[model samples]
Target chain A: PLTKQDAVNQMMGFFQAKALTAALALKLFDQLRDRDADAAHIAARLDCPARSTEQLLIALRAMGYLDQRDGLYHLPAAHRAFLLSDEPQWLGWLGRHIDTFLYPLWGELKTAVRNDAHQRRTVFGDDRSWFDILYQNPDDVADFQEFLGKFAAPFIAGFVRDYDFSQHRAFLDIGSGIGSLPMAIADAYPGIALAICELPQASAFLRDKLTLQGYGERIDVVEGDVISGDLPIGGYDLIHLGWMLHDYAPETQLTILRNIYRAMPAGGRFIASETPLNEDKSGPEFTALLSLNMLVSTDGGIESSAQEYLDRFRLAGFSNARIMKIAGPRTLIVGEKL
Target chain B: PLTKQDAVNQMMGFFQAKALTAALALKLFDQLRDRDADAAHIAARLDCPARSTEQLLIALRAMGYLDQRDGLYHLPAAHRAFLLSDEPQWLGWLGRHIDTFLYPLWGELKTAVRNAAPFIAGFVRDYDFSQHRAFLDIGSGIGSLPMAIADAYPGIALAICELPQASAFLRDKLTLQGYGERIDVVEGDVISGDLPIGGYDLIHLGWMLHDYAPETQLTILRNIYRAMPAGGRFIASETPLNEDKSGPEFTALLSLNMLVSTDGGIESSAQEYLDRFRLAGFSNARIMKIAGPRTLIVGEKL
Candidate 1:
């Protein structure tokens, strides 16, 4: 039954987004982690207006991100991991990204849909590629990389634990933001050679993060552009692209796949992980909306079904294309070079 | 239990906003009312891209605003009343209002919250306008409140106090609504307190105070106080915060809305409203319980 509540909830969708962003901007979640603090204490610590800070706190509490007991507020230990910026698993980084990038672009979603164009040129007045604009500043780089790392946590876990990485002598990951998949593979399969392919603008930051995480020697970083058909190296037996193909049009995706196929050794395997639409193209609600997201934010980026991806892989000259099931949010499309 | 579904739904909030706004802009619901049309027909009527129009229809159908039978789309009977622009109960007006005003204001909600200011100078809510002998509504935009009062209370003399610039529009609207003889349009600025606004026993300020700073609000309140007869009641309707300030979320966000859009307009708690009433030299200041959409802050001029 479609009740009035459903309509009202949908209409006021921006409320939750605004509320969450305000909490992140004020570091409200971080302040209450592992301790109970009253509104007065929060005001004093954050140097914010008492009334306004309390209003934000109350909204957060109402939103179920915080709990109150005996005139004090507390963040659940489990939620603190994802809600606090200081924590490695924090989602506040993504919240910041949404506040800075996604929110404004989405404000002009109607125009984006009408024109079938990315809104970067419209919203931010920047006509460069999404990554070019995103990596122009260090803080944005951190926000994007740290959040991508956090987002890949589940998929990386499923890939390392269930997939047979030990079967391949060398593995390459393209557009490997923050080296999450490579680090996981290096940790799980010590004997396998690991490498990451990233854009030149972002490779320096990736190398810095890989060095700080002590995987500097184990994993090699290569700078390359996939769209230009000029990949750097050719020796890897297995190459993986994690959630990157959806950032381009289907035609461009096929081009990138062919480029990877051309670079891979004969008998090597290639896999691209994506949260694809259903076989019927119905939806996994998030991916359906994400298709719209790619429309607004990227140059013809979109979500495709597993069959659609396989067809692209076949069109790109792979001999065998099949779906590999994983115990994560993403489905893997594997293809083989004859 | 807060599930991952709740989080994902919250993240996709703007999808619905855009979907609804696009439909309203295209008049999709209005077109489908009392008629069944396929995607091709709708695209031709709206002069939109077929693919994008179908995408919106799929979303709307998924959201239960549209029903599709054998490739034909129809607006549900219950939905048509509110969704069609021709109906007085039309919600598309609100959709337009949000697209034009509230959405942009909310884009700066964080800034509004940080500064404790409103984004614009508008507020809308419902209240019992028939409780007193005569009612004067200050800053009546479009005269909806005054018209509603005229509809509900025939014997209660109704008048709208609008700025000189907006008086013509309200006069035209009231005339079109057939309330020209029933309601009077007074052109005056409440801030200046220079209008012929005396003798009205009950002056109703409808959701207007939150659009001004406390000082300006007090000035308006005192100005209203001066124009009313002694012992007459003045009711200012507002969606106030709870006395404890826990929050009914929309009003809380509206307070932030005031912070961003207006010069110094801000939301207040019920206690805060009463305190302001006291400061403006009104006696017997208290809140009146009503079954309407707004909380009425009632005070008597002594």
Candidate 2:
């Protein structure tokens, strides 16, 4: 572990990760499925050249993903779970995403950090928001939606189970995340009227999707801009924004929050779900990495601690701001429009 | 500690590497030389923004590279050597190389493994794999050394000897590099004494001696000596243990590695290697430190 945390170790540590990533990308494991095969047999099946294929098999075997009997390699059953073989489509998608998007951005992490800017401008030569680049390409957007649905399925489906929904008469979820948070709220609390805010451009599509989900009569689609401050004034008594605050810079977040505050009535609760950093800002690791992930992927979205977020809430004219410590993968920051 | 060899541990491990790289990239440590500063103050000096910069500091601190006292950070001396503190140039160069070159290439590691040929520039720059009519390299891994020799010594004929298991890789690489006709591939193992039996005037064995017993290392040396034509020069490269055995950490572990993996296999010092070479019925046996990653022990069959 930390015992091996030296500069040279860090420099060379990436070789192993790529070593594993490529094995998955090449679909190297599928070769050993029917029977044990040496590097030669595996190479032929891979439609790849022999020498490099042999080297990878040797690396995987030595790294414990495979076991060798003389020269023949067998995939150990124990690591299959981590290999994501149970859901190989997602596994392959993630592996491909790392190649298509993540690595190129990370290739210039230092340049981005030095300039305090996003790598999208440098890498893709497109100075637009992260989503626009992916969405413009039809196949890219189609694949991304499928991937997003699978990726956020675990955490998004359980928010209704995690938080209490009966207190608010009407609820507004500011952004429609990959489909399911507020509808599950509608299912759990029938009396709580619901509306999800989206930009005017997309609300029509949102309406069509809501109607398709049979939420046409119940959960309404409310057209509003989170940044333009065009949200409906004093309609839903409670508002919840899920994981969108960290998608903006601090100034942009305050602007987005102030607009949401301006739209809600006095004493109505406002909640924003976030994966917060530690108070010391000394990394809970995932949040910290996500902060860097945001730097590379988005314009300026960054992770903040509970206190940092609560302070931002207060600055946006919300009072009694506190951490909700909800029963889900994220913490809920609660503030009131006083 | 020899080298990390676990599967899952390796899968999620590259983040720390990049995190530390960015710290050096931003020259984050250079900011705190005179005083211990918090992330805010350090951010200003780094000329980087607070959020992502703080996240990196947080990661570096938690990764044990820095010690935080009341939110002010200090680089600990105990880990300084590991940090490569004394040599910042190599550290930054390696970090930049990983970010700019190795990482992106490594991203396509499977594709490269499937096809990309190594532009191995190590031996070509330092040692001349030349001075003879024909060169035979035993245990040539991917044949890059001889491939370099093939280019440098175009007048000389080239041949590579490899184990039956490794022959396919060598043969495949040669065909692709278009060395198939010019440089011949011979299937054999050094320890088995299946030398190609050609009148090769210059023979090179790359790091084969250290993997066997000193007695068996003798088998390799004498076999090469007997196989060569008169006036042939045989050179074998190895990372021998330092005479005092004080450091060169990886070589020390390699000594233990040989013990665990092979029977009676051990690493020896340069003096010990020369003694073994001279004892194996060769004249002018001596150590030649190639200005690369290995030490060369050379002997001439007279």
Model 2 lDDT tens row, A1-338: 23323667765666666666777788788777668888788999989766457556655654556777766888666555445445433255556666667666776777777776789878888788765664456455445555554545445555677667897888888866434677778887889888888766666776777789898888887778787898884788889887889988999999999999998988899989888987777767666777776787788888888898999999999989998775546888998987
- Scored against the true structure, residue B261 in model 2 reaches a CA lDDT of 43
Worst 10 contiguous positions by lDDT, candidate 2 chain A: A81-90
Predicted candidate 1 versus true structure: per-residue lDDT over A1-338, tens digit per residue: 46544666577777777777777777877777757999888887888777667767777776677777766988876576567777776556656667777878877777776776788998898879865655577556655666677667789999999899989999999887778888988988989999998778778888988999999899999988787867875888889988889888888898899998888888989999998877644455567667777877887787777998999999998977999999889889999999
Clashing residue pair totals per candidate (backbone < 3 A) = 12, 0
Worst 10 residues of 2 chain B by lDDT: B1-10
What does candidate 2's lDDT look like per residue over B73-149, in tens digits?
88665554434435433366667776666666566666565650222355556666555788888887777877787
TM-score of chain B of each: 0.84, 0.61
lDDT scores for all predictions? Answer: 0.77, 0.72
Candidate 1 C-alpha lDDT tens digits along B149-175: 665667888888889888888899889
